[PDB]
Each structure stands twice: as C-alpha cells, then as structure tokens.
Swiss-Prot record:
This is Glycoprotein hormones alpha chain. Disulfide bonds join 7-31, 10-60, 28-82, 32-84, 59-87. One of its GO terms (cellular component) is pituitary gonadotropin complex. Heterodimer. The active hormones thyrotropin, lutropin, follitropin and choriogonadotropin are heterodimers composed of CGA, a common alpha chain described here and a unique beta chain which confers their biological specificity to the hormones: TSHB for thyrotropin, LHB for lutropin, FSHB for follitropin and choriogonadotropin subunit beta/CGB for choriogonadotropin. It comes from Homo sapiens (Human). Keywords: Disulfide bond, Glycoprotein, Hormone, Secreted, Signal. Shared alpha chain of the active heterodimeric glycoprotein hormones thyrotropin/thyroid stimulating hormone/TSH, lutropin/luteinizing hormone/LH, follitropin/follicle stimulating hormone/FSH and choriogonadotropin/CG. These hormones bind specific receptors on target cells that in turn activate downstream signaling pathways. Belongs to the glycoprotein hormones subunit alpha family.
Amino acid sequence: APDVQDCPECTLQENPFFSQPGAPILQCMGCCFSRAYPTPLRSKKTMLVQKNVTSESTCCVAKSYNRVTVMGGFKVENHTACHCSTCYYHKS
C-alpha cells in the first residue's frame, strides 16, 4: 500500500532477544514525529505544546523500567512504560 515510510515510532522495541518468561524485553526506540507539519492526523485538539529544536529533539525515556539486565550486564530497563519528552535534564 504505502510507497514511503519513515523510521519506526517512539516506543519500546520489545526485545525478542532478552525476552523473558512473561516479557519480550525492550529498549525504547523510535522517532517521535515532531516536525513543522504533522501527519494529517484526526484526533489531537486538547492542550499539547509543540516547540521542538534543531538537532536532537523530544524522546521517550521509559516511564517505568523492569530492567532485565542482559548480556554484558546490559539494561533494557525492561521498559514497562515510556514517555516522550525532553532528554537534556535527566539520566545524564
């Protein structure tokens, strides 16, 4: 159908790697579509404020992780929840 599709969407890329007995692990990965011309859409209307910036923009930082430290002591913060927002004032 589609002839053009950008990268995935901001969210968890459920780890089919670290997948656990009840959780396919994760690693919030996507691209919070926030440009000067959002897709046609047909829902938004409430508050919501947009003012992205050049180079590096809003992102999702697992609201709540279930960290399932894997290989090499990795950490998919078994993302139980992810919230898209700023990334220059936390986790640094």
